[PDB]
Design an enzyme around this catalytic site. Structure first.
Site, mmCIF file in Angstrom:
data_model
loop_
_atom_site.group_PDB
_atom_site.id
_atom_site.type_symbol
_atom_site.label_atom_id
_atom_site.label_comp_id
_atom_site.label_asym_id
_atom_site.label_seq_id
_atom_site.Cartn_x
_atom_site.Cartn_y
_atom_site.Cartn_z
ATOM 1 N N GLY H 28 60.620 -18.550 -4.182
ATOM 2 C CA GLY H 28 59.998 -18.197 -3.081
ATOM 3 C C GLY H 28 58.894 -17.261 -3.180
ATOM 4 O O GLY H 28 58.467 -16.724 -4.113
ATOM 5 N N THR H 29 58.238 -16.964 -2.129
ATOM 6 C CA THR H 29 56.961 -16.130 -1.910
ATOM 7 C C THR H 29 57.207 -14.631 -1.806
ATOM 8 O O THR H 29 58.569 -14.591 -1.466
ATOM 9 C CB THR H 29 56.017 -16.454 -1.018
ATOM 10 O OG1 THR H 29 56.407 -15.819 0.361
ATOM 11 C CG2 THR H 29 56.006 -17.896 -0.406
ATOM 12 N N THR H 30 56.441 -13.937 -2.273
ATOM 13 C CA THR H 30 56.790 -12.666 -2.500
ATOM 14 C C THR H 30 56.775 -11.728 -1.045
ATOM 15 O O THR H 30 55.907 -11.884 -0.505
ATOM 16 C CB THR H 30 55.900 -11.509 -3.409
ATOM 17 O OG1 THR H 30 55.844 -12.520 -4.803
ATOM 18 C CG2 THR H 30 56.346 -10.344 -3.850
ATOM 19 N N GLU H 45 53.860 -12.273 1.526
ATOM 20 C CA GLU H 45 52.781 -13.142 1.099
ATOM 21 C C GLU H 45 53.068 -14.615 1.597
ATOM 22 O O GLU H 45 54.079 -15.117 1.166
ATOM 23 C CB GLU H 45 52.694 -13.319 -0.707
ATOM 24 C CG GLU H 45 51.721 -14.161 -0.967
ATOM 25 C CD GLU H 45 52.268 -14.467 -2.613
ATOM 26 O OE1 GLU H 45 52.996 -14.389 -3.015
ATOM 27 O OE2 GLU H 45 51.126 -14.833 -3.186
ATOM 28 N N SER H 73 62.459 -14.527 1.172
ATOM 29 C CA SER H 73 62.104 -15.437 0.375
ATOM 30 C C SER H 73 62.875 -16.442 0.076
ATOM 31 O O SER H 73 64.119 -16.255 0.144
ATOM 32 C CB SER H 73 61.461 -14.761 -0.759
ATOM 33 O OG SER H 73 60.616 -13.471 -0.397
#
Lengths: 237, 227, 194, 248, 200, 230, 221, 242, 229
Positions: H28-30, H45, H73
């Site tokens: 996943g995204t940070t 993010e 995330s």
């Protein structure tokens, strides 16, 4: 999910058979032999037990009273049989409470066989590994001898054996059974059939459970001394 | 094994596709919708001469102006038809008005994917034919996938592959009701393995004036002579 | 309602009043307050207007189901026990059946007639003659005088006629006569000319 | 719980595999034995400790089910613990609430075996991995000793042993048992058999022994009721076992 | 009060190695007498039970106790004893604490092992040593028993005592009468006797 | 080994049943959504099983202020639209409040997610484009079986939707400022959906258009009603 | 509750459990039913004959049910059918028609083929009788899949194909067996390719033929 | 063959389905969280998958009650499911008692819920790691909850694809500022850390979302960082890259 | 083949899933030891916090079940917290039902029975934790009761859990106010593990007559200083 671990007990084989029922019958085929003989004046239930330190005088593992007029011989798992026998006793008492009459033998056998069949069609549970021989008296048909198996099929008999060596025992019964024998002759026949179908070298009183129903009807589950006496008089000794 | 409600890597439910292939083995059913009515015809396919073919009910009445044909596992068709009849009667009870044909088809198809641990989808396909003031004479093809389309002419069952092409060739918006009867009988005679007659095929039609009716063997025989 | 039962040497005779009254008017004057439970068992009932028939058909359906299932006929004693159990269940339900029944039957195995009186509470008793409610207040004197165990069917019918005559003279309602049925070894038959 | 099907099923040979495996688990358990004398029953077992710092006094392998009924096991200890809890609860609810007295030994044994058979047939459960030796006294049957198997089968015994050394112990009991045995003789035979079965130290702390014998009004906790007899089940203390082992 | 709907009385007495239980036979519907053969005393093996109160409740309880004692005999391989049966009756009655049967049960019997006569009244058990009464004439019965009873009566004297008490209590009760039955219960034999009394 | 159930993670952390439910949408007919500040437009390419058959309904109307279009399993779309109608109904009944488009999208998010974590069910095999108008203006939402709900200026779902989506990305700055001229926004949607055709052209029976806006209740154009936009 | 889908479609569109239930039926004993103008005759080819149940069972006074396959499953089906007939009498004031009872039995069988946790009945039933106050004979058949149909003559069990061929060559739908003698003799001839015979007649006149009559029929053949 | 069911121990004692859920989280995204001297800052993010996304409208950070912020995330729908459970839990606490739920109590409730999803094979482990926290009567708390149900308190937390670089930057923050960071400078540094961690996902553009819950700045309530402060943090992060 | 995946018997009569839960008990690589004084029970647990971003005051494997009972868990902290919540609920429910505080042994039997249920029912997996309960019982005095994934529990004079539980166990066997007991336990853990402890490497719980409590880092540093002297 649990789908991976399910054995699918209540399914058909491609040949139309039910695997678990056949396996339960195979299980019973190694159980101790139980024999029922319906004579002209009553029925004879005889069962072969299957050690020195065993309390034989107390052990009652194959012959059970369901009523004042109905008894069962058991072949297979004894604990499943105890469950079914408790249900049968409660059902017979429910019938007596409802109608003030003793339950007919066939109604009780049918109810027990319906319980057995229910475990074969739904629920996901394994069948009872028990075969019964019902010896009973009622005013409609008199002395009746039924048998039932894990599939829930029940049939009426003049002489029937369940457990181990059913084929040999049935051959002997076919050879030696007459419709007009008395209860004493039926007792003799049951002892001879058990002696010629036992896997042990000899048949002794400690290895035997015996019961008769005679006319009012009287149930007698034999004590070890009475079994010893009947063994001596029959000639097996 | 695999779950009944599983998707395939191509985005299709396994049991639904298997049910469709079960439908492909069913008896042929043909429906043609015209400006004067909808004609439904089925292939009887009696398994034995001792079988009383007049007892084969492959065209049933859902409501006074709604009838349908079935193809495939017709034992599931009876449950589907009982649900459809209950839906139509409940609509008349709740709204004091006859149900719309498309609404009836929606009510039927709402059962299609209501299965999983219902153990399986239905193994039968329906050709729903009906009339109402809102949309006139309508013909729908209900599938166990839950999808249905309105069809001018539709054929389902074992012989559907060539029957649909023949209906494509033959159907036009100006067909009369009797032309529809002749076309249905012609397609059935073309696709039925047996020699078509009044005992191995059945006809029915829905009209505004007379409602849903099933043609008797006598009247069907007269129509068969016309071919 | 007025229900009389009388057991004679070889048969049971049941008499049931014919009138149906709701409020201000007598709606019916020819009602039959009996149900055939089996070919040799008959049940006559009295009590609350809607409960009696409902309970009677429920009992009849159950007895018919038993007969079909066993291919056999329940004895009148067993039928009376089942009816008593049903009434005893009802008396402590959410809404009991206010039904009093007389069960007359012929035991084909004992070859004896049997009459059982069961009230709404579930009190069953085997009687040579019986009546429910106020009906026995105007009949019990006469049966206590003239009933004999060995009475024939004709004598039982005469005694029932006398009882009905006394009921018509001193009871303050008009029950519009009675319908008389006889249960014996030949089955159940009705006496129209009573 | 999606496990509603049986985990114990028949094999093509007719065997119930889970029951056989539970029996195998029992055979790997510590040896426990029971001897029935004329005037009592003695049940004994080894107390095998997992750690030398464990307080084995806290782990009782012999349990009182009713004042006149006691139980010992071989196999999986937690299964025995939950079975003992259920057995006490059933001995109260199913019998003593109804009849005002504790059940006779055979009826309690049948109830325990029913609990075990339910684990044999119900959905989503394995069988219990214990065999129980249940010793008891009742007014009409006197002293009795029952073995209950994981399948739910139970049998009365004059003397029997279950567990790791059950075969040799049963042979020794066959040699030693007789129908004129007194309770003290039964205890002596039990101690000899357990001595032959125990590997390491053999003393009152490594051995658990209980008897069904005479009523103990001193263990009743109250006086003034002549018909209240006092428990017949009595667990021998480590001091008593040590005394009976010194004069062995 | 449903107990007074049907009427009837039950009395039990202990003698020398014997017990007696007696009851009237009237089955009534308020003032109207319906049956003179409604015996309120039942036995399950060697344990006798008299039940007064609502007659339908009497029949229901007799059926329930026959059921339970039959199952007891099948499970236990022995007949139930009077003390165990008393506990069974108490537990069965309190199983319906807020749905109660309108009954008064009386247990009579001799314990087969000890041989001591046993009687009991009731859910709360009144295990008296002299006499137990129940029914609509319980006050008349109490007076008659408290006056007539003496300990250690022989079976004949016990029969006379319990018979006189029952008859004279029933004479003064409107809803009791129409005959009476007395059971003289000993370990070896049980004698049933029907009494001659007023039929009003 | 890991694709047989939605309750199983793959060794790389993937849910294969959800991906197959997505592939179910990718097999469906393309529908295009786009919006300006005042209006939101649904353009759908209806698909017919046979040339003797009618074209399957792609656009569903929830109420005067909201409606959706579907790509994939039609029964799943019907179930989701029924749930959405129930949510809007509950909002109107309990609060006299028109349900916001974003809140309805989140309710669809939760309902879709419940089928990806518990055994026995399956992910919905349908994707939805929800257009609506509320106090905050025009809204376009893309719903996915995985539970992901996204608010976009324009989007396309279904077979060959990439051409339409690329065209919308190229045209973005033009059509977001169309504002109060609904016909031009519908025209832009029609060009976007025409960018996704391969063989068949847009016809009177093929094309289905929906619109909702400031003073525009949710209206669907079918048949000759779309002939001016083709 | 156990609700695993045991009856599901195979890739070829077949429900294997229903096919195997049909196999179980085909391993059943016999049920030959020959319908005439006025007769419906049902027949089948150390046991205690008194208490062994006859295969033909009365669902009501006018409808009887023979079966083939698993006897234990058939008991449950027959119990449900009898309860349904009694309930129909109780609530609709009328005894069931043969078609209504056949539809109910086939509905139970079909329900068991698409309910989770259950297997289909391995039973096919021949339901015969007369509608209330009616006189035209009915002979229906149900199968494990739930399919029910009406037949002039039908057989189920072992040797069903051979006996059905014999019926198809001996029974003619142009001229059904005219007499009860013709019905019984055709049934016995089919069963001769031990015999029990039950004749169903209007107004709840259902009788099983005695062994003497059956012996006379056999000797004539 | 021990990785096909949720509640199965491998012979080593591991739950492989939980590890696969952790792999999903790592995909996943940070998202990060920084605990300042009087509050907590959350930054995430948001990848701009297409130009057609409405800016500042696909909000990832969620509020629980009024004082708890949650960012996660991995599988965003799983995070939304967890946040719905957390909102129900906070409501139940605020109904039975009256105080807003304490952050450690809320962390325990979420951990119990996530751990319950590892107990049966009929359920799937959560495919998210949640950074959550807020201000209660005992101050500011920051927690990171993993798919196993494990959670700890953190001075700074990070998950997602660029979790390693974000953890390095948060460690530098903890080293350089033992005195305790201020909420505004914490917001700026969260922007900086998200921008730095995006270098591991530079193939696509991203949108920065920040929220904070400070005793002084936001009065102990969770509020999104928007407007002048958001743009100031964005400029600080852009400058700090060079 | 599936006997290793659910808690059914293997052909050897073993429950492989229970054994694998035992294996899982050592994932955290934490060693703990419990010792009884004549008046107090002391649990020393290793506190390994390698990540510098962690708030150390939250990392804790010691739980206060009730006023008098404390629990130290060896195993993953999610299962540890599950067991802690269940034990707290059991203690409160016992106090409600029976009018007095639950003894440590009763609670240990309570949790062992729950573990047995997980061991016998297929849809429940075992918790991969070992639970050590400590208290000063008002009847039995200082008490240590340890439960394992098999549903087995027993009382201990002293006990150690963890990967190096054997070394600590033999060290305690060789040996065989609460501040002195704490100092003894810390010194013996240092000797057994061969590692000096800072104030941040240890978790200390003390069960006294009136309450169970855990020492803070300052108290642990005080005890370490006392050991240094």
């Amino acid at each position: 999910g649990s789908r991976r671990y399910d054995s699918r007990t209540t399914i058909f084989s491609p040949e139309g058979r039910l695997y678990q029922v056949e396996y339960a019958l195979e299980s019973i085929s190694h159980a101790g032999t139980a024999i029922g003989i319906m004579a002209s004046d009553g029925i004879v239930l005889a069962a072969e037990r299957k050690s020195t330190l065993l309390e034989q005088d107390t052990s009652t593992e194959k012959l059970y009273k369901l009523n004042d007029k109905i008894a069962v011989a058991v072949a297979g798992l004894t604990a499943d049989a105890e469950i079914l026998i408790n249900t049968a006793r409660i059902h017979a008492q429910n019938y007596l409470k409802t109608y003030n009459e003793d339950i007919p033998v066939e109604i009780l056998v049918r109810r027990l066989s319906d319980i057995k069949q229910g475990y074969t069609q739904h629920g996901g549970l394994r069948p009872f590994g028990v075969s019964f021989i019902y010896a009973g008296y009622d005013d409609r048909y008199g002395y009746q001898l039924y048998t039932s198996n894990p599939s829930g099929n029940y049939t009426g008999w003049k002489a029937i054996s369940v457990g181990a060596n059913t084929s040999a025992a049935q051959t002997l019964l076919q050879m030696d059974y007459k419709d007009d024998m008395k209860v004493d002759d039926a007792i003799e026949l049951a002892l001879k059939t058990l002696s010629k179908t036992t896997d042990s070298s000899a048949l002794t009183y400690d290895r035997l459970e015996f019961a008769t129903i005679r006319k009012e009807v009287y149930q007698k589950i034999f004590k070890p001394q009475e079994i010893k006496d009947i063994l001596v008089k029959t000639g097996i000794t | 094994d695999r779950g009944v409600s599983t998707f395939s890597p191509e985005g299709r439910l396994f049991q639904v596709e298997y049910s469709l292939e079960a439908i492909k083995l069913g008896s042929t059913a043909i429906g043609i919708a015209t400006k004067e009515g909808v004609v439904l015809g089925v292939e009887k396919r009696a398994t034995s001469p001792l079988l009383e073919s007049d007892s084969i009910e492959k065209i049933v009445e859902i409501d006074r102006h709604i009838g349908c044909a079935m193809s495939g596992l017709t034992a599931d068709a009876r449950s589907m038809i009982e649900h459809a009849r209950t839906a139509a009667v409940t609509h008349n009870l709740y709204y004091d008005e006859d149900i719309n044909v498309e609404s009836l088809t929606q009510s039927v198809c709402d059962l299609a994917l209501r299965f999983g641990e219902m153990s399986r989808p239905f193994g039968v396909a329906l050709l729903i034919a009906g009339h109402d003031a809102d949309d006139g004479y309508q013909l729908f093809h209900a599938e166990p996938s839950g999808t249905f389309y309105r069809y001018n002419a539709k054929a389902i069952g074992s012989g559907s592959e060539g029957a649909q092409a023949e209906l494509l060739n033959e159907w036009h918006s100006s067909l009369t009701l009797k032309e529809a009867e002749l076309l249905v009988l012609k397609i059935l005679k073309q696709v039925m393995e047996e020699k078509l007659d009044e005992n191995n095929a059945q006809l029915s039609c829905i009209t505004k004036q007379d409602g849903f009716k099933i043609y008797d063997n006598e009247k069907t025989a007269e129509l068969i002579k016309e071919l | 309602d007025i229900i009389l039962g009388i057991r004679v040497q070889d048969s049971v005779i049941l008499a049931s009043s014919k009138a149906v009254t709701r409020g201000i008017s007598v709606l019916k004057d020819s009602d039959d307050k009996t149900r055939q439970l089996s070919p040799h068992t008959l049940m006559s009932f009295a009590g609350e207007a809607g409960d009696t028939v409902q309970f009677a058909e429920y009992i009849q359906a159950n007895i018919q189901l038993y007969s079909i299932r066993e291919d056999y006929e329940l004895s009148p004693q067993a039928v009376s026990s089942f009816v008593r159990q049903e009434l005893a269940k009802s008396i402590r339900s959410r809404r009991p059946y206010q039904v009093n029944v007389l069960i007359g039957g012929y035991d084909k195995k004992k070859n004896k007639p049997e009459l059982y009186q069961i009230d709404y509470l579930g009190t069953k008793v085997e009687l040579p003659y019986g009546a429910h409610g106020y009906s026995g207040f105007y009949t019990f004197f006469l049966l206590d005088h003239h009933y004999r165990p060995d009475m024939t069917t004709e004598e039982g019918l005469d005694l029932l006629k006398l009882c009905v005559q006394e009921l018509e003279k001193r009871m303050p309602m008009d029950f519009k006569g009675v319908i008389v049925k006889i249960v014996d070894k030949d089955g159940i038959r009705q006496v129209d000319d009573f | 719980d999606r496990y509603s099907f049986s985990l114990t099923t028949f094999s093509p040979s007719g065997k119930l595999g889970q029951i056989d495996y539970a029996l195998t688990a029992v055979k790997q358990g510590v040896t426990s034995l029971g001897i029935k004398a004329t005037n009592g029953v003695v049940i004994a077992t080894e107390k095998k400790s997992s750690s030398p710092l464990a307080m084995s006094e806290t782990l009782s392998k012999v349990s009182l089910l009713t004042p006149d009924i006691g139980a010992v096991y071989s196999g999986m200890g937690p299964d025995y613990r939950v079975l003992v809890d259920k057995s006490r609860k059933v001995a109260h609810t199913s019998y003593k609430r109804i009849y005002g007295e504790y059940p006779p030994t055979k009826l309690l044994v049948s109830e325990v075996a029913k609990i075990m058979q339910e684990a044999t047939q119900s959905g989503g459960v394995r069988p219990f991995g214990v065999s129980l030796l249940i010793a008891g006294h009742d007014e009409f049957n006197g002293f009795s000793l029952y073995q209950v198997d994981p399948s739910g089968s139970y049998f009365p015994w004059k003397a029997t042993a279950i567990g790791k050394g059950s075969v040799a112990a049963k042979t020794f009991l066959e040699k030693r048992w007789n129908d004129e045995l007194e309770l003290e003789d039964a205890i002596h035979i039990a101690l000899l058999t357990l001595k032959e079965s125990v590997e390491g130290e053999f003393n009152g702390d490594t051995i658990e022994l209980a008897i069904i014998g005479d009523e103990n009004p001193d263990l009743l906790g109250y006086t003034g009721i002549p018909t209240d007899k006092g428990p017949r089940f009595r667990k021998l203390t480590s001091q008593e076992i040590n005394d009976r082992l010194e004069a062995l | 009060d449903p107990s007074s709907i049907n009427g009837g009385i039950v009395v039990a007495m202990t003698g020398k190695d014997c017990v007696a239980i007696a009851c009237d036979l009237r089955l009534g519907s308020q003032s109207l007498g319906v049956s003179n053969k409604f015996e309120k005393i039942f036995h399950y093996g060697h344990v006798f039970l008299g039940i007064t109160g609502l007659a339908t409740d009497v029949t229901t309880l007799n059926e329930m106790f026959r059921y339970k004692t039959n199952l007891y005999k099948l499970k236990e391989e022995r007949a139930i004893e009077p003390e165990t049966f008393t506990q069974l009756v108490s537990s069965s009655l309190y199983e319906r604490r807020f749905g109660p049967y309108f009954v008064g049960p009386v247990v009579a019997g001799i314990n087969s092992k000890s041989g001591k006569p046993f009687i009991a009244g009731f859910g709360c058990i009144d295990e008296a040593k002299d006499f137990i009464v129940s029914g609509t004439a319980s006050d008349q019965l109490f007076g008659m028993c408290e006056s007539l009873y003496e300990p250690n009566l022989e079976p004949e004297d016990l029969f006379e005592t319990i018979s006189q008490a029952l008859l004279n209590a029933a004479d003064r009760d409107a809803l009791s009468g129409w005959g009476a039955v007395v059971y003289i219960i000993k370990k070896d034999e049980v004698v049933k006797r029907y009494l001659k009394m007023r039929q009003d | 080994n890991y694709d047989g159930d939605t309750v199983t993670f793959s060794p790389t952390g993937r849910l294969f049943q959800v991906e197959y439910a997505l592939e179910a949408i990718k097999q469906g007919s393309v529908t295009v959504g786009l919006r300006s500040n005042t209006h939101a437009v649904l353009v759908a390419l209806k698909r017919n099983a046979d040339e003797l058959s009618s074209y399957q309904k792609k656009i569903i109307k929830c109420d005067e202020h909201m409606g959706l279009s579907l790509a994939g399993l039609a029964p799943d779309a019907r179930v989701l639209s029924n749930y959405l109608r129930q949510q809007c109904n509950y909002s109107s009944l309990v609060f006299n409040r028109k349900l916001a488009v974003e809140r309805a999208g989140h309710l669809l998010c939760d309902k879709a997610q419940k089928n990806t974590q518990s055994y026995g069910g399956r992910p919905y095999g349908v994707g939805l484009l929800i257009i609506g108008y509320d106090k905050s203006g025009a809204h376009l939402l893309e719903f996915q079986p995985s539970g992901n709900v996204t608010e976009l200026y324009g989007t396309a779902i279904g077979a060959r939707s990439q051409g339409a989506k690329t065209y919308l990305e190229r045209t973005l700055d033009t059509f977001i400022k169309i504002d109060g001229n609904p016909d031009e926004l519908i025209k832009a949607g029609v060009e976007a959906i025409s960018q996704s055709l391969r063989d068949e052209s847009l016809t009177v029976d093929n094309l289905s258009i929906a619109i909702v806006g400031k003073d525009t209740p949710f209206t669907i154009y079918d048949g000759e009603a779309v002939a001016k936009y083709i | 509750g156990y609700d695993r889908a045991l009856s599901i479609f195979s890739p070829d569109g077949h429900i294997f459990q229903v096919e195997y239930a049909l196999e179980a039926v085909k391993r059943g004993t016999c049920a030959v039913g020959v319908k005439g103008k006025n007769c419906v005759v049902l027949g089948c080819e150390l046991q205690d004959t008194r208490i062994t149940p006859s295969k033909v069972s009365k669902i009501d006074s006018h409808v009887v049910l023979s079966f083939s396959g698993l006897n234990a499953d058939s008991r449950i089906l027959i119990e449900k059918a009898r309860v349904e007939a009694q309930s129909h009498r109780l609530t609709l004031e009328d005894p069931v028609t043969v078609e209504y009872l056949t539809r109910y039995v086939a509905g139970v069988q079909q329900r068991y083929t698409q309910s989770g946790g259950v297997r289909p009945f391995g039973v096919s039933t021949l339901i015969a009788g007369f509608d209330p106050r009616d006189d035209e004979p009915k002979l229906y058949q149900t199968e494990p899949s739930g399919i029910y149909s009406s037949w002039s003559a039908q057989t189920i069990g072992r040797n069903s194909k051979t006996v059905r061929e014999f019926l198809e060559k001996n029974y003619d739908r142009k001229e059904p067996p005219a007499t009860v003698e013709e019905c019984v003799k055709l049934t016995v001839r089919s069963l001769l390719e031990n015999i029990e015979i039950t004749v169903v007649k209007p107004d709840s006149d259902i009788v099983a033929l005695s062994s003497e009559e059956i012996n006379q029929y056999v000797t004539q053949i | 063959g021990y990785d096909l069911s949720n509640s199965v121990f491998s012979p080593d004692g591991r739950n492989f389905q939980v590890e696969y859920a952790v792999k999903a989280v790592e995909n996943g995204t940070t998202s990060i969280g920084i605990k300042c001297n009087d509050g907590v800052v959350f930054a995430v993010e948001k990848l701009i998958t297409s130009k057609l996304l409405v800016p500042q409208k696909n909000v990832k950070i969620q509020v629980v009650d009024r004082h708890i912020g949650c960012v996660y995330s991995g599988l965003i729908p799983d995070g939304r499911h967890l946040v719905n459970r957390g909102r129900e839990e906070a409501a139940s606490f605020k109904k039975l008692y009256k105080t807003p739920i304490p952050i450690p109590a809320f962390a325990d409730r979420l951990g119990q819920y996530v751990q319950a999803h590892t107990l049966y094979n009929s359920v799937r482990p959560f495919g998210v790691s949640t950074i959550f926290g807020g201000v209660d009567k005992n101050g500011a708390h920051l927690y990171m909850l993993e798919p196993s149900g494990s959670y700890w308190g953190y001075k700074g937390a990070a998950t997602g694809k660029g979790r390693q670089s974000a953890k390095a930057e948060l460690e530098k923050l903890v080293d350089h500022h033992p005195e305790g960071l201020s909420a505004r400078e914490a917001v700026k540094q969260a922007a900086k850390i998200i921008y730095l961690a995006h270098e591991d996902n530079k193939e696509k553009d991203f949108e920065l979302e920040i929220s904070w819950c400070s005793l002084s700045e936001t009065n102990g309530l969770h509020k999104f960082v928007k407007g002048d402060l958001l743009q100031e943090a964005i400029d600080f992060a852009q400058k700090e890259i060079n | 083949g599936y006997d290793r995946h659910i808690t059914i018997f293997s052909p050897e009569g073993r429950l492989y899933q229970v054994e694998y839960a035992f294996k899982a008990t050592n994932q955290t690589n934490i060693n703990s030891l419990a010792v009884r004084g004549k008046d107090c029970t002391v649990v020393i647990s290793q506190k390994k916090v390698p990540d510098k971003l962690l708030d150390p005051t939250t990392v804790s494997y010691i739980f206060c079940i009730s006023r008098t009972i404390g629990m130290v868990v060896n195993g993953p902290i999610p299962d540890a917290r599950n067991a802690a919540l269940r034990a707290k609920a059991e203690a409160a429910e016992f106090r409600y039902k029976y009018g007095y505080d639950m003894p440590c042994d009763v609670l240990a039997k309570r949790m062992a029975n729950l573990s047995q249920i997980y061991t016998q029912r297929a849809y429940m997996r075992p918790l991969g934790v070992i639970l050590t309960f400590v208290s000063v019982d008002e009847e039995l005095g200082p008490s240590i009761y340890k439960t394992d994934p098999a549903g087995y529990y027993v009382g201990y004079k002293a006990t150690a859990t963890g990967p190096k539980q054997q070394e600590i166990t033999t060290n305690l066997e060789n040996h065989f106010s609460w501040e002195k007991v704490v100092e003894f336990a810390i010194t013996h853990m240092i000797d057994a593990l061969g590692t000096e402890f800072s104030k941040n490497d240890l978790e200390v719980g003390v069960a006294t007559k009136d309450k169970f409590f855990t020492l803070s880092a300052e108290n642990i540093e005080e005890r370490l200083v006392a050991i240094a002297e």
